């Protein structure tokens, strides 16, 4: 298993431009397009990112490509993190994944303000951090993301993916 399919199945693939959330235009795995009210900035954006005249559409490749470089991208906020990077450092790769879908979730800021969750992680308290993280608004306001993110954490394997 991997982040895509992880991200593909938490976060979703969006074939065509729509509106996240929030409101911003997205696509594919929650790309954000821009944040400008108007489709004919998203296609002009997306056309940027594609590389060709899309007209607010892509094909799954597409979508994995662009994904593939918002992963990246999030990792490297993450290693440009005083509070993330020791924490990642230390995580091993299938927790690693969990991280890099919270940072896609609610961006580097986000992940970086639970403070003690972090701290355990750190630790390794698995269980305590799940049970630390069971408790975020985060967690009540996505809860089958969140579930499967945290007992990610805590078992440290795919497990919570494999029969959905």
Same mark, same amino acid.
Not at 12 to 20: F, N, P, Q, S, V
């Given at each position: 298993?991997?982040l895509? %399919? ?6 979703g693939? &969006?074939?065509?431009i +729509?509106?996240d959330? !929030?409101? +911003? ?9 821009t944040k ?13 990112? =594609? ?5 607010? #559409?892509? *094909?799954?490749? %597409? /979508? ?6 918002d #992963?990246?991208?999030? #990792? @490297?906020? =993450?290693? @440009? ?11 091993? /790769?299938? @927790? ?6 919270? #940072? ?7 992940? /970086?303000?639970? *403070?003690?969750?972090? @701290? ?7 269980? !305590? /951090?799940?049970v630390?993280?069971?408790?975020? &608004?985060? +967690?009540?306001? *996505?809860?089958?993301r969140?579930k499967?993110?945290?007992? *990610?954490?805590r ?10």
């Amino acid at each position: 298993m991997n982040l895509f %399919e992880m991200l593909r199945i938490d976060e979703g693939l &969006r074939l065509k431009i +729509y509106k996240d959330t !929030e409101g +911003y235009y997205t696509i594919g795995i929650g790309h954000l397009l821009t944040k400008s009210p108007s489709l004919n900035a998203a296609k002009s954006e997306l056309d940027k990112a =594609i590389g060709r005249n899309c007209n607010g #559409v892509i *094909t799954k490749d %597409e /979508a994995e490509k662009l994904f593939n470089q918002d #992963v990246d991208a999030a #990792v @490297r906020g =993450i290693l @440009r993190n005083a509070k993330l990077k020791p924490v990642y450092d230390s995580l091993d /790769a299938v @927790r690693r994944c969990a991280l890099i879908n919270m #940072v896609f979730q609610m961006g580097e800021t986000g992940v /970086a303000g639970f *403070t003690n969750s972090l @701290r355990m992680l750190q630790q390794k308290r698995w269980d !305590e /951090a799940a049970v630390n993280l069971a408790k975020s &608004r985060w +967690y009540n306001q *996505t809860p089958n993301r969140a579930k499967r993110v945290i007992t *990610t954490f805590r078992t440290g394997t795919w497990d919570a993916y494999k029969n959905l």
